[model samples]
Target: SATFPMQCSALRKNGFVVLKGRPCKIVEMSTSKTHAKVHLVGIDIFTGKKYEDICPSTHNMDVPNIKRNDFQLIGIQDGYLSLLQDSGEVREDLRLPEGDLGKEIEQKYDCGEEILITVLSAMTEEAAVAIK
Candidate 1:
């Protein structure tokens, strides 16, 4: 499972988040029969795409990190695509992983969309940067 750079608590209704590079606002949230996850449905405010999934609670070990990397989708070659970061950094080594989510991301990027990347729980910038 992928973790994000940031962390967030269990979401309530009306919360906003960026999933797969699309800004989504939670329209519904409810407890599920699953022991540790919650069911949520959201709609992309701009694209009108609707998404539904079961997400782990903040307290659950499976909870994904919240940190995200936003990059503009660009040309693809050799099974990898060029990603331009917000700071103008060009990353040429990014590739979509093999899985359902990866396929979904690849589809979105192929359509000339921006993408978001998240990793397992990682150190925060404050923890990594030197304080003068």
Candidate 2:
């Protein structure tokens, strides 16, 4: 329900923004004189996919209503998550990530590991972007 707008030039590495149809983690950027725009590359957080976007340097870029949850791991429910927060209560119902990352987490579950978890939520959809 909430998001921020930032200019292309204002974006920094590791910044979060919506690229293509998904939220992305800014990885690279360059200003192009020919097109008179900034060329930006971000890794799609939904999947480890490369994303490139060209926007005017002074133009407004849409930032997603997204942020991370540095939470604890209680369990995985049918490939879903059971997350616990130190400052907040327990929550679940979010899916594991897609592809091998999900497989990595899925495989690690059998090891009886309860590693700290970090996840990003983009609007209504949320997934484990990485494991801590």
Candidate 3:
């Protein structure tokens, strides 16, 4: 899935939306009457950064429809993940991510345990977001 436009009021919290050409999580929203200066704050899903914008409440806003998949984690090679998709599509570009997720990836894989990885894909990038 890609993107679609909907009125600002149609947006809901924790949903995906585009702000400054970046797909972000809608974290906060507030509005004022008489002119409806709708103020909003969003967090970048990829970078974990913050963004804010103000616009008319009735205006249009576009959002990304993020995609996620659970792939069989087969190997950890040179610090990157080798996943086997359901269609047998190869994994050549993913990695054990940073922070807590990366630590978990290391401990489990090192112990030779079977694992499935949850991936987040949007725009031009993908990341290992969760595990099962």
Name the best candidate (by lDDT): 3
- Report the number of clashing residue pairs per model: 5, 0, 0
Give the TM-score (vs. native) of candidate 3.
0.88
Where model 2 places Cα greater than 4 Å from the true spot, the runs are 34-36, 98-113
Q: Candidate 1 vs candidate 2: which has greater lDDT?
A: 2
Q: What is the C-alpha lDDT profile of model 3 across 36-96, one tens digit per residue?
A: 7778899999997899988788899988878899988888888899998989897957878
- TM-scores of the candidates in the order shown: 0.36, 0.72, 0.88
Positional deviation of 24 in candidate 3, in angstroms?
Answer: 0.6
Error of 2 at 109 (Å): 4.8
Q: What is the lDDT of residue 91 in candidate 3?
A: 93
The lDDT of model 3 is 0.85
Which stretches in model 1 have alpha-carbon errors above 4 Å? 1-9, 59-132
TM-score (C-alpha, index-matched) for candidate 1: 0.36
Please write out the lDDT profile of model 2 over residues 10-50, one tens digit for every residue.
88889877886677889998887853688888988766699
